[PDB]
């Protein structure tokens, strides 16, 4: 029974959810933007592996280079550090761990597939979903095998379908990033609506009528 | 039972406060039934405002009829 | 005739609207995005299903694999589970039923074909609009018959026309998804000032003049 | 002369434009999307109507089937019903009339050709602009005549140009769809800004200083 | 036909308030007729602020005579 | 000990954060908008360097002009002056340096890569992230070679791939600038909440009960 | 030494900012929205100046008409009148002139380029930013020379490059307009806070305790 410590409780709770709710979203958006930066780099590079073949509708495409690059990206993103973790929003040094219940809740609210949870020995961390990129790497292998020493040969008719699939995957990643960013309109706005806990000090400090 | 010149003044507004409670409760219920319209939000502000206005007006009436004769009884000598 | 519990009923009304109006729409967009991702997987698998022929305009197009894959996707998306229902927004466990009037009121604002209402034995549920996939899967059978052991033989012009129809269908699906996502401005935008029912707490707390 | 009635008129006019300003945009978008879905169905059905002739550059074009289907589409969308109306937001039963003044003030903003206003006996209604579709279905007859029993025989040199023009027509109609959909962002945001007339109650309720 | 000093002051405000209240409705119905422009919204906003600020001026110009005459009564002895 | 100087420090620290917290934000957004203004001038000005290649699928692409323009943009934006620095928001004249600690603090919450800190002799400054643009001008070299006197001979498939990469980079920079502008919703809002230190002067004057 | 002169000072000061600080922003917004309406009219007019060329991928674009129209618009806004000036918010009659000090000091936060200060012989005025519009006018002739007597022919790749550049320019201008309108958050709300100068008539008039 005290009203002087209730304001301290309010002050510490407001900052106790800043790194629990909004800071988590901040690090999630930052790491996903880093992921999209890497993907955009690897896509911009990809413009430089096409040649005409037999001077016809056939155009070569380099598969071994793309496979190597995408697999390297996955491997660099498959570890656990400050650049490839979503929760619990590590910063500075080391790796902070999380329990099963809150990680599951964050996964459910973020709407991500099951292959996003990893165990860092002690606790659990949430990583970026690699399902779309792995799917594209497996499907680009559906175009054959690197029989030529350099790259595969394939006609415009197949190229249109392959580019359509690539654009579909890219726009899926774009929509995932857009959903994550638009989560801010439903996170920061209610954070500012919840900062109105300051009424707990405003109205209770106007209670000087208790002492006239 | 007993009622002075202030109790009846307060009860004069009581005939509308109950009506407005019923109306605002129906407003919340019908908003819960369907919230996809600004018409109900506008009616909500139209009705909560009338509620606050009734309550504040009744408080003003009782306060002013307290002060009307607090001064008269102060110099009652 | 009470005011102490009117604030509680306001709070519970806001709580019920969130999971009956906003949470429902979130589950709708989530399941529909899962649907679009599955279809994107299917379209990505299309790349390794073409073969140049006659060293001319002819391209063998696989139809048996496409028919089987689309039929399988329809079968897995025609049942009722947590990953197929959009209303009444199943979550956690079990399947919840809905009435006719509310189903109609949801279909009127979702802009979906009426050929989506099915009964889960006891009550009624709303499912994803599968009509475009159906029309496409019977239309692809209109390109001929699978007389060949592997795939259809077909010149470039008919392939171009079929691909134009395919991409038109896919932009229709994409614009459906765009409408569902843009319904952020139709749901969250009005929920942001629907949460202003808290005036029934704040503006009914300045009535302390009633007790001076 | 009182203020309860002006609050009532605010709460009434905030909805008088919901079904008269935004609802009109809603049914416009819905009917035009259904239009585009039907057109995409016709395009998909058109695909399997091509055959190589003389085993060379010649590809038969099925003129009669396209002409019949587009004539049927013109006939069925030349009427005035719930699936072929734009104005005055007909729903439920019958067809609602309208005067020419608001029809002009609407078509001025919709940026549509004049040849879209018809009279339904009593009043005036707006239908989808068939001018691109009608001009293209007239042009398709200007590139030959169905002398053959089934379909025209014609080289791909002009066929590719004709298909490019047909895809350009699809692109124009799709851009019209995009403009009508973005009309939401020009109206839905405008509506959510205009719903801030509620200051007419917020400020006129805090003037209680009339009675303390 | 009574009208005291406070009623006299309120007389100079009622005729102004009535005009604003009649024109705010003529702004609102026009806005509801053609809401596609922001200029008419600005005009309606200006008329509403006109009405409310004049009403508030009336509200305050009476409580400021209230305390003057009350202080006169306090020293009226 | 006194509490009149608390009123003056309330003024002086609002001054000390008006141009040190919101001031740096407005300067950063202004210089970033100028950056993208110049970049969009370049991009729109890029359009007039396309020629048909042999009147066919080939379409010549200019690389040397783009190389020189982008390298000039980097060189002009790699220095430290009034229009190339973010923090400490130098304005008026000279160049204002900043200490490493505050530079890192501002880098962490501005969400920029570590390759952005430049030292102007004495201290540190934070500039725009030029890594996407410099990697773009580096990879455009890998698109081929300018063996021709004027421009590179470029086919439609590789051109479409390169344009996809370019638009991906463009929308990435859109996302970056949108985040920077939306940081107003995070900073100006808290500054307008923090200007409520005026209550510390209003309320510390309503304590006049000490002197009746 | 007087308090009634303090009240007169407040009365004249609250007017010395209402039309000299907030009024400036209001008139700037009005004239800039008029300019944007002119731009939208130009865009709507241009939207119907397109055609296919050679019945293929080539597009006709009217360069001379857009050049003439936009030069007319620029040179009509290059003058100084009631509809082409930002500061000092000219109205009524004549043209209001200004000196260096306040003009520079307020274009500092209006964030306009140097080539926006015009001299009406005697004094100085602030006009809209014609630089992006003049840049579009200049680079619309970067497509080449109008060989045809009517309009230019250019392959579709160049057409989408040019349209993307134009869209980038118009969206940059839209962001400028959005920033200038959002400046109300720093002007109108700040004036609403600053009007609290009447506390001198509120609080210092409570000093009737000096007269009992």
Q: How far apart are CA F95 and CA F85, in angstroms?
A: 9
Using an 8 Å Cβ cutoff, are D97 and D87 in contact?
Answer: no
Method used to determine the 3D structure: cryo-EM
> A15: phi > 0 → left, psi -120 to 50 → alpha, else beta; which?
alpha
Half-sphere exposure of residue A46: CA atoms within 13 angstroms, side-chain side: 24
Whether chain D has a CB inside 8 Å of the CB on B19: the answer is no
Long-range contacts of A79-84 (CB under 8 A, 24+ apart): A80/A118, A80/A120, A80/A125, A80/A127, A83/A31, A83/A34, A84/A31, A84/A127, A84/A128
Q: E-strand spans in C54-210?
A: 58-61, 85-87, 117-119, 124-127
Count, in order, helices (H) and strands (E) of chain D. Answer: 7, 4
> Residue with structure tokens 């100079």?
E12
Whether chain D has a CB inside 8 Å of the CB on C161: the answer is yes
Residue A112's nearest CA partner among A132, A98, A95 is: A132
- What is chain E's alpha carbon radius of gyration, rounded to the nearest angstrom? 18
Q: Is the CA virtual torsion D177, D178, D182, D184 positive or negative?
A: positive
CA distance D38 to chain B (A): 30
Rounding to the nearest 10 degrees, give the CA dihedral for residues F31, F36, F37, F43: 160
Packing angle of the helix pair F22-46, F5-18 (nearest 10 deg): 10
Alpha-carbon distances, residue E28 vs D8, D10, D202, E32, E53 (angstroms): 12, 8, 16, 6, 18
Using an 8 Å Cβ cutoff, are G118 and G125 in contact?
Answer: yes
> Residue with structure tokens 């009884």?
B73
Using an 8 Å Cβ cutoff, are F152 and F136 in contact?
Answer: no
**Which of D2, D197, D204 to mutate to probe the E interface, most E CBs <10 Å?**
D197
CA distance A100 to chain F (A): 29
Residues pairing with G118 in the sheet: G125
Q: How far apart are CA A84 and CA A126, in angstroms?
A: 9
- What is chain A's alpha carbon radius of gyration, rounded to the nearest angstrom? 25
- Classified as helix, coil or strand, G99 is coil
Which H/E stretch holds residue F177?
helix F156-194
Q: How many residues does chain F have?
A: 212
Using an 8 Å Cβ cutoff, are C198 and B48 in contact?
Answer: no
Using an 8 Å Cβ cutoff, are E10 and E62 in contact?
Answer: yes
> G54: phi > 0 → left, psi -120 to 50 → alpha, else beta; which?
left
Angle at G71 between CA G69 and CA G74, to 5 degrees: 110
Alpha-carbon distances, residue F76 vs E4, F35, F72, F82, F134 (angstroms): 78, 11, 6, 12, 13
Domain span including residue D31: 1-212
Residues of D in contact with G47 (CB under 8 A): 111
Q: Is the CA virtual torsion G5, G11, G12, G16 positive or negative?
A: positive
Residues of B in contact with C13 (CB under 8 A): 28, 31-32
**Which of A115, A156, A157, A169 to mutate to probe the C interface, most C CBs <10 Å?**
A157
Q: Residues near F167 by Cβ (< 8 Å), separated by ≥ 6? A: G164
Q: Is there an interface between G and B (3+ Cβ pairs < 8 A)?
A: no
Q: What is the DSSP letter of D17?
A: T
- Classified as helix, coil or strand, F203 is coil
Whether chain D has a CB inside 8 Å of the CB on C101: the answer is no
Residue C65's nearest CA partner among C49, C51, C52, C80 is: C49
Angle at C191 between CA C188 and CA C196, to 5 degrees: 145
Residues of C in contact with B31 (CB under 8 A): 13, 197
> Residue with structure tokens 């304001």?
A7
Using an 8 Å Cβ cutoff, are F116 and F55 in contact?
Answer: no
CB-count burial class (<10 Å; 0-12, 13-18, 19+) for D179? middle
Q: Residues near F207 by Cβ (< 8 Å), separated by ≥ 6? A: none
What domain count does chain C have? 1
Q: E-strand spans in D12-55?
A: 50-52
Alpha-carbon distances, residue A19 vs A23, A87, A119, E5 (angstroms): 4, 11, 21, 63
Q: Is the CA virtual torsion G192, G196, G197, G202 positive or negative?
A: positive
CB-count burial class (<10 Å; 0-12, 13-18, 19+) for F157? buried
CA distance B4 to chain C (A): 18
Contact D165 G44 (CB under 8 A): no
Q: How far apart are CA C203 and CA C10, in angstroms?
A: 13
Q: How many residues does chain B have?
A: 77
Residues of G in contact with D111 (CB under 8 A): 44, 47
- Classified as helix, coil or strand, F66 is helix
Q: How far apart are CA G20 and CA G88, in angstroms?
A: 8
Whether chain D has a CB inside 8 Å of the CB on B63: the answer is yes
> Residue with structure tokens 């200051």?
D199
Residues pairing with D125 in the sheet: D118
Using CB atoms, which residue from F169, F179, F182 is nearest to A44? F169
Q: How far apart are CA F51 and CA G173, in angstroms?
A: 29
> How does strand G59-61 pair with strand G50-52?
antiparallel
Which pair of tokens denotes residue F21?
């917290």
Q: How far apart are CA E33 and CA F149, in angstroms?
A: 64
For this entry, resolution in Å reads: 3.9
Size of interface B-C (CB pairs under 8 A): 47
> C51: phi > 0 → left, psi -120 to 50 → alpha, else beta; which?
beta
Using an 8 Å Cβ cutoff, are C205 and C6 in contact?
Answer: no
Rounding to the nearest 10 degrees, give the CA dihedral for residues F23, F26, F28, F32: -170
**Which of G155, G206, G210 to mutate to probe the F interface, most F CBs <10 Å?**
G155
> Which residues numbered 117-156 in A keep a CB inside 8 Å of some CB on F?
156
Neighbours of A177 (CB within 10 A): 18
CA distance B18 to chain D (A): 18
Contact C167 A162 (CB under 8 A): no
Q: How far apart are CA C144 and CA C166, in angstroms?
A: 16
Q: Residues near D131 by Cβ (< 8 Å), separated by ≥ 6? A: D113, D115
Contact C40 A168 (CB under 8 A): yes
Q: How far apart are CA F51 and CA A56, in angstroms?
A: 21
Half-sphere exposure of residue G155: CA atoms within 13 angstroms, side-chain side: 16
Using an 8 Å Cβ cutoff, are A95 and A122 in contact?
Answer: no
Q: How far apart are CA G162 and CA G159, in angstroms?
A: 5
- Classified as helix, coil or strand, C150 is coil
**Which of G109, G133, G142, G195 to mutate to probe the F interface, most F CBs <10 Å?**
G142
Q: How far apart are CA A48 and CA F143, in angstroms?
A: 5
Q: What is the DSSP letter of G118?
A: E
- Classified as helix, coil or strand, C60 is strand
> Residue with structure tokens 């406060």?
B17
Q: How far apart are CA F169 and CA F132, in angstroms?
A: 7
Q: Residues near A156 by Cβ (< 8 Å), separated by ≥ 6? A: A57, A58, A59, F157
Q: What is the DSSP letter of A54?
A: T
Phi and psi at residue D198, to the nearest 5°: -55, -10
The answer, yes or no, to whether the previous bond of E13 is cis (omega within 30 of 0) is no
Q: How far apart are CA D62 and CA D71, in angstroms?
A: 14
Q: Is the CA virtual torsion G102, G105, G111, G116 positive or negative?
A: positive
Alpha-carbon distances, residue D36 vs D118, D171, D178 (angstroms): 21, 11, 11
Which pair of tokens denotes residue E29?
């119905």
The answer, yes or no, to whether the previous bond of D52 is cis (omega within 30 of 0) is no
What is the DSSP secondary-structure string of chain E? ----HHHHHHHHHHHHHHHHHHHHHHHHHHHHH-TT-HHHHHHHHHHHHHHHHHHHHHHHHHHHHHHHHHHHHHT--
Rounding to the nearest 10 degrees, give the CA dihedral for residues E61, E64, E65, E70: 160
CB-count burial class (<10 Å; 0-12, 13-18, 19+) for B4? exposed
> Residue with structure tokens 């057109």?
D39
Using an 8 Å Cβ cutoff, are G52 and D168 in contact?
Answer: yes
Using an 8 Å Cβ cutoff, are A128 and A86 in contact?
Answer: yes
Q: What is the DSSP letter of D54?
A: T
CA distance C54 to chain D (A): 11
Q: How far apart are CA G195 and CA G173, in angstroms?
A: 33
Using an 8 Å Cβ cutoff, are F133 and F73 in contact?
Answer: yes
> How does strand C85-87 pair with strand C124-127?
antiparallel
Q: How far apart are CA C37 and CA A169, in angstroms?
A: 8
> Residue with structure tokens 């100006």?
F188
Which pair of tokens denotes residue C49?
């299903």
Q: Residues near G141 by Cβ (< 8 Å), separated by ≥ 6? A: G63, G67
Q: Residues near D147 by Cβ (< 8 Å), separated by ≥ 6? A: none
Q: Is the CA virtual torsion D17, D21, D22, D27 positive or negative?
A: positive
Percent of chain A that is helix, strand, coil (3-state, to 5) = 60, 10, 30
Residue F200's nearest CA partner among A192, A205, A200 is: A205
Which pair of tokens denotes residue D170?
């699809």
Whether chain D has a CB inside 8 Å of the CB on E29: the answer is yes
> How does strand C58-61 pair with strand G123-126?
unpaired
CB-count burial class (<10 Å; 0-12, 13-18, 19+) for G209? exposed
Residue D20's nearest CA partner among B31, C187, E32 is: E32
Neighbours of C128 (CB within 10 A): 19
Q: How far apart are CA D4 and CA F8, in angstroms?
A: 48
Q: How far apart are CA D25 and CA D37, in angstroms?
A: 18
Q: How far apart are CA B46 and CA B42, in angstroms?
A: 6
Residue D108's nearest CA partner among B48, A208, E36 is: E36
CB-count burial class (<10 Å; 0-12, 13-18, 19+) for B20? middle
Neighbours of E39 (CB within 10 A): 9
Q: Residues near D68 by Cβ (< 8 Å), separated by ≥ 6? A: none
> A10: phi > 0 → left, psi -120 to 50 → alpha, else beta; which?
alpha
Phi and psi at residue E21, to the nearest 5°: -70, -30
Whether chain D has a CB inside 8 Å of the CB on E15: the answer is no
Using CB atoms, which residue from D10, D13, D209 is nearest to E60? D209
What is the DSSP secondary-structure string of D81-145? STTS--BS---SSS-----HHHHHHHHHHHT--STTEEEETTEEEE----HHHHHHHHHGGGG--
Which pair of tokens denotes residue A67?
């496979």
Residue E17's nearest CA partner among D197, D3, D203, D11 is: D3
Cα A130 to its chain centre, rounded Å, is 10
Q: What is the DSSP letter of C98?
A: B
Q: How far apart are CA B50 and CA B48, in angstroms?
A: 5
């Amino acid at each position: 029974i005290s009203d002087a410590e209730i304001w301290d409780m309010v002050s510490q709770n407001i900052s106790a959810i800043g790194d629990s709710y909004l800071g988590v979203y901040e690090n999630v958006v930052a790491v996903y933007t880093d992921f999209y930066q890497a993907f955009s780099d690897i896509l911009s590079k990809m413009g430089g592996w096409l040649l005409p073949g037999k001077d016809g509708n056939t155009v070569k495409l380099d598969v071994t280079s793309l496979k190597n690059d995408l697999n390297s990206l996955v491997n660099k993103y498959n570890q656990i550090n400050s650049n490839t973790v979503l929760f619990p929003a590590q910063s500075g040094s080391g790796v902070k761990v999380a329990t099963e219940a809150e990680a599951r809740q964050w996964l459910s609210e973020l709407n991500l597939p099951n292959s996003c949870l990893k165990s860092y020995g002690s606790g659990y961390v949430v990583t970026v979903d690699l399902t779309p990129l792995q799917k594209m790497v497996q499907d680009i292998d559906g175009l054959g095998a690197p029989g030529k020493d350099s790259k595969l040969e394939m006609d415009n008719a197949k190229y249109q379908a392959w580019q359509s699939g690539f654009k579909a995957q890219e726009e899926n990643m774009k929509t995932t990033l857009q959903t994550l960013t638009q989560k801010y309109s439903n996170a920061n706005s209610l954070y500012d609506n919840l900062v109105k806990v300051l009424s707990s000090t405003i109205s209770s400090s106007l209670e000087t009528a208790k002492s006239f | 039972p007993w009622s002075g010149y202030l109790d009846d003044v307060s009860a004069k507004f009581d005939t509308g406060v109950d009506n407005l409670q019923t109306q605002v409760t129906e407003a919340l219920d019908k908003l819960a039934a369907k919230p996809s319209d600004p018409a109900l939000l506008a009616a909500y502000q139209s009705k909560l405002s009338e509620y606050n206005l009734y309550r504040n007006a009744q408080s003003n009436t009782v306060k002013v009829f307290k002060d009307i004769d607090a001064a008269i009884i102060q110099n009652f000598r």
